[PDB]
Amino acid sequence: PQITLWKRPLVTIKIGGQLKEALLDTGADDTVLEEMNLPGRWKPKMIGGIGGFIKVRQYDQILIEICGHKAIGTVLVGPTPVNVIGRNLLTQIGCTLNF
Amino acid sequence: PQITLWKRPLVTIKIGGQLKEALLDTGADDTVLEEMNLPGRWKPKMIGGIGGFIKVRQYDQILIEICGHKAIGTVLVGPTPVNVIGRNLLTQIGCTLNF
Numbered sequence A, B: 001p002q003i004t005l006w007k008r009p010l011v012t013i014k015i016g017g018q019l020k021e022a023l024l025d026t027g028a029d030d031t032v033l034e035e036m037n038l039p040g041r042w043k044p045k046m047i048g049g050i051g052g053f054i055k056v057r058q059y060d061q062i063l064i065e066i067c068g069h070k071a072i073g074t075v076l077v078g079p080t081p082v083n084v085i086g087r088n089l090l091t092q093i094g095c096t097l098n099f
């Protein structure tokens, strides 16, 4: 699809078999989701944003579908203010900026 | 043009008579710029992201040129680690997400 930006680019994602809403975020290197239960092993990591750093659980090689497009990559889980889909997965679904 | 997301979508902008590098950021409602001494009146604001909130100064009707495309609107100025062009100006230069 072509998504205009007069509204937040929110889309439905599927991860761990559960549906969620997330924000397509070209300013995010990484994908960061709010607290949730995910199967498999994880490692603790730190990520920084505009307001400082937070602790997250890093899940590697996770299946995640974004608006019907499949991706498999790293998902960070922690106290983010909103679910954000970052460039690590946007590249996988073939997302570009155009003007 | 078309910008892929393999790397950060950094572009050159012109604001306040200065050239700067900024991210085309679909995850930001408004534009947020690193500390700079803009003239004119402003309004305090708080914006929240990963890590928490920062205090910024809101300037209205500020002219910005983004890759040769003129825009005018709200710019938030504060101790952000990066300049981000948000949706308030991305819409004005005709920027869409595509996949």
Ligand SMILES: CC[C@H](C)CN(C[C@@H](O)[C@H](Cc1ccccc1)NC(=O)O[C@H]1CO[C@H]2OCC[C@H]21)S(=O)(=O)c1ccc([C@@H](O)CO)cc1
Pocket (backbone or CB within 6 Å): A025, A026, A027, A028, A029, A030, A031, A032, A047, A048, A049, A050, A051, A081, A082, A084, A086, B025, B027, B028, B029, B030, B031, B032, B047, B048, B049, B050, B081, B082, B084, B086
């Ligand atoms: C809550 C939704 C997102 C988080 C909101 N942010 C935009 C988002 O693109 C930031 C931009 C950014 C910030 C600092 C360094 C680098 C990039 N990226 C980000 O945090 O990414 C994380 C994960 O990947 C890593 O790579 C880069 C950092 C890591 S914001 O800046 O905090 C923001 C909040 C409110 C407003 C107001 O206008 C109302 O929207 C505008 C902007």
